[PDB]
Ligand binder design. Structure first.
Ligand code: NA
Lengths: 275, 275
C-alpha cells in the first residue's frame, strides 16, 4: 500500500485509541503518533492525536542527550570510553543506580548513556549534561530538526521547574529523533549501540505491558507527577513501527493502565490489520 | 484490639482478597499473609492464604542475603565499606545496573546490598553469594528460624533450574524474616540501613501500584517466567503491617494486575477497617 492507503486504514486505529482514551482518561491531555519506518524513506504516518502539542518531556529528553554523545564519538570529538567522575554533579534522587553509590567511582560516556537510558538514571543524565553543555545539546536538536524538544533544566531541579524552566517534547519531534536513530542503527558501531541500548530498556510498565518478555522494544519511558510517557520502535514481521504516547494531566496509575491498553492496540493493529 | 478480635475482623479481608483472586487468577497458585507488627511482640496474623506453600523465590531470597551481610557487619566479621571487584563473578543479565558496566569497578558490600535490593541487581547478588558462601547464607536462615527459605542457586543459573535446584520461599518464612528486620530497625546503624534500603525499593508495579508515590513501603519484589511476588512492611497511622503476596503459575501481566488490586485492598483494610 502507498502512504495514503495506510493513512486511510489508520483511521480505524485512531478510533480505537480515542475510544479507550475517552473511557479511561476523558480529562487527560493525551497525544500519540504511530508511524511506519523504512530505511531511507520518510516515515509514513498511520495514526495521530495531538502530535504537535508540547508536553513536559520528563525523562524522554534523555534520548536526545544519548544521540548527542554518540554524535560526538562518531565525529571524534570525544572518546566514548573516556571517564567522568561520579563527583562531577550533585547527587539527585528520582531513580537510578548511581544514587545508591557512595565511593569514588568513574564511568565512561558509554556506561553513563547506558544507565541514563535503561534505568532512567538521573545522576548519569546530569553528569552528561554537566560535561556536554545544555546549549550544545539544544544546538544538536536544532541541527537534527527536532528542536521542539528542549533541554532547559537538569534532572530533579525543582527550583527550575518552579521558575518556569522545564524540559519539553512533542510526539512528532520525538518520532523524528527516533527515525534519525533508526537510520544509524546499521551504519556503524555507535548507531548500533544506540539501537541496542534502546532495546535494553528495563521499564516495561507502559506500552509493552501486555506484549510478553520476548518482544523487544526500542524505547524510553518518562514519568513525573501526573505525566506518563513511552515512545520507541518495534520490529515486527510487517516492518518497523514507531509508537509514541505522551500522557499529561493524568493520575500516574491511570496513565500506566491506559498506556498498557494503548500499546496492545497499537501492536495488534500494525501486525494484523495494516497492509 | 486483641489478636483474636483482629483475626476475626481479618476474615473479611480474606474474603475480599479470595474474591479478587478467583476473578483474576482462578487457576493461579496464589499465597498471601497480612500481619500486624509491633515492637517486641509476636506478629499478629490478620489474613492468610496458602501461607506455608513453597514457591520459587525469584528474587525474594535477596532479603536473606542482605540480612546476612549486615549480621556479619554487626558482629565485626566484615567491614561493610570493604570492596569487592565487579570481576569476581561472571556477568549475568535479567536486570540491574552492573550488567551495563564494562570498566574496572569495585563496590562496597553496602553498595552491593543496595543495588541487589532496590533494583534487584543480579550481578550484585551473585557477587555477594560468591564472597559470602551459599552454605553460610542458608545456615543464617536456620539460625533465624526461616529456613523454609533456601538459597540453592545463583541468579540466572539456567542449568540449576533444569537440574532441580531452585531458590524457595514461603509467605510465613518471609514474614518472619521481615519481623526480624523490623526488630533491628532502631537498634543500630546496620538495622537502620536495612530498613532504609527496603524503603528505597524502586519497583512499584505490584502492591503499591495504586498507593501514590508519597507512600513509602519497605519491600522487595520478585519476578520470573509466570511468577510475580511482592512483600514488605508498610508504616500507617494505625501501626506497621506486613503484606506478602506470592503468585505462581500466573501470566506475568495478570499477576502484576492482581497484585495492584490486592495491595490496594490490603492497605485500605488495615488503615480504615481493622481496629
Ligand atoms: Na505496571
Amino acid at each position: 500500500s502507498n502512504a495514503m492507503e495506510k493513512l486511510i486504514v489508520g483511521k480505524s486505529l485512531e478510533h480505537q485509541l480515542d475510544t479507550v482514551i475517552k473511557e479511561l482518561a476523558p480529562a487527560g491531555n493525551i497525544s500519540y503518533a504511530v508511524l511506519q519506518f523504512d530505511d531511507e524513506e520518510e516515515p509514513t504516518l498511520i495514526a495521530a492525536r495531538g502530535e504537535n502539542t508540547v508536553h513536559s518531556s520528563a525523562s524522554l529528553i534523555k534520548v536526545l542527550i544519548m544521540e548527542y554523545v554518540f554524535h560526538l564519538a562518531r565525529t571524534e570529538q570525544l572518546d566514548i570510553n573516556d571517564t567522568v567522575p561520579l563527583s562531577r554533579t550533585p547527587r539527585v534522587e528520582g531513580g537510578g543506580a548511581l544514587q545508591e553509590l557512595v565511593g569514588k567511582h568513574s564511568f565512561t560516556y558509554l556506561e553513563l548513556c547506558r544507565l541514563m537510558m535503561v534505568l532512567s538514571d538521573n545522576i548519569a543524565t546530569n553528569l552528561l549534561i554537566t560535561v556536554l553543555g545544555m546549549e550544545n545539546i539544544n544546538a544538536r536538536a536544532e541541527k537534527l530538526g527536532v528542536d521542539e524538544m528542549e533541554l532547559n533544566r537538569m534532572m530533579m531541579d525543582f527550583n527550575a521547574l518552579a521558575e518556569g524552566r522545564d524540559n519539553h517534547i512533542t510526539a512528532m519531534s520525538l518520532a523524528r529523533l527516533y527515525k534519525h536513530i533508526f537510520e544509524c542503527r546499521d551504519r556503524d558501531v555507535y548507531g548500533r549501540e544506540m539501537w541496542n541500548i534502546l532495546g535494553r530498556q528495563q521499564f516495561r510498565d507502559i506500552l509493552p505491558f501486555y506484549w510478553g518478555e520476548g518482544i523487544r522494544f526500542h524505547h524510553k519511558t518518562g514519568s513525573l507527577d501526573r505525566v506518563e510517557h513511552d515512545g520507541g520502535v518495534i520490529e515486527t514481521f510487517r516492518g518497523h513501527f514507531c509508537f509514541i504516547l505522551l500522557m499529561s494531566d493524568i493520575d500516574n496509575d491511570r496513565g500506566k493502565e491506559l498506556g498498557a491498553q494503548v500499546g496492545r492496540i497499537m501492536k495488534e493493529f500494525v501486525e494484523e490489520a495494516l497492509p
